[PDB]
Write a protein that binds this ligand. Structure first.
Ligand SMILES: CC(C)c1cnc(NC(=O)Cc2cccnc2)s1
Length: 275
């Protein structure tokens, strides 16, 4: 747009393309994303929290829509890829998890869901902050962080879907491998079932009456969490287990998760970021 000078292409998305850009007015360095949306997006402009990437402005113009965001220098996917020989130190993982849970507790209190949390939409800065990006906005779309209720075809899913996605990210930080790297919808589902056990009416009341549930799904037994995320300690395994409960109603809320004993000794480390 007239008021912005493109600096470089950050990336490419489900909807549109993302540029690092400078405001010739404010001097401001921002990220520009080019794609009843107007009213929904306007509502996102007021959803302000230290752990949500600030939506600065919305520009509708020429049947194109531009979202102007706060710019951050790195995403968690890149930071995980760069930290993979060493692993992200546990106090930083814990700090990131806690902050994201704060962000989620906020948005969820306002009945706003992210719906597509993934390392790529978690942005970090040199100060040790992490932020939820592309919030309430909802190449091959990644399935790896999708909650089972979405995969089984629930139309009216809840905030719990974000807790699921964040649990998957927690596990990946800890182990340095994706928890459930599905490359199709059924592969994603069956990867979950192979680890967590095929769900049934005992652990998830109503599951067998979900739109895409099939009685023909193979019945796999649950694995122990000790095997899933070693060497994460008993507090973290406990918390992760609660974020990965099948029944969205049993699944821990962000607000309750913040009170979990895992965070008794949370601190805010500085990451080593090479930009
Ligand atoms: C669209 C909006 C949510 C964003 C705001 N800040 C962003 N930063 C990066 O994607 C990280 C990055 C990648 C490549 C080059 N520079 C920064 S994305």
């Amino acid at each position: 747009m007239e008021n912005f000078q493109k600096v470089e292409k950050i990336g490419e998305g489900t909807y549109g393309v993302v540029y690092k850009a400078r405001n010739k007015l404010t001097g401001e360095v921002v990220a520009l994303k080019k794609i009843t949306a107007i009213r929904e997006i306007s509502l996102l402009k007021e959803l302000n929290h230290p752990n949500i990437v600030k939506l600065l402005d919305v520009i509708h113009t020429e049947n194109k829509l531009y979202l102007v965001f706060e710019f951050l220098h790195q995403d968690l996917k890149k930071f995980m890829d760069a930290s993979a020989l060493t692993g992200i130190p546990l106090p930083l993982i814990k700090s990131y998890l806690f902050q994201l849970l704060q962000g989620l507790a906020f948005c969820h209190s306002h009945r706003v869901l992210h719906r597509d949390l993934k390392p790529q939409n978690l942005l970090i800065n040199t100060e040790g902050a992490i932020k939820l990006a592309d919030f309430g906005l909802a190449e091959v779309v990644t399935l790896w962080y999708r909650a089972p209720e979405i995969l089984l075809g629930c139309k009216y899913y809840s905030t719990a879907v974000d807790i699921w996605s964040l649990g998957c990210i927690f596990a990946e930080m800890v182990t340095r491998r994706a928890l459930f790297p599905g490359d199709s919808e059924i592969d994603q589902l069956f990867r979950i079932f192979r680890t967590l056990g095929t769900p049934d009416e005992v652990v998830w009341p109503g599951v067998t009456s979900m739109p895409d549930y099939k009685p023909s799904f193979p019945k796999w037994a649950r694995q122990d969490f000790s095997k899933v995320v070693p060497p994460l300690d008993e507090d973290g395994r406990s918390l992760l287990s609660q974020m990965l409960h099948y029944d969205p109603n049993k699944r821990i809320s962000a607000k309750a998760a913040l009170a979990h004993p895992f965070f008794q000794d949370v601190t805010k480390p500085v990451p080593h970021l090479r930009l």
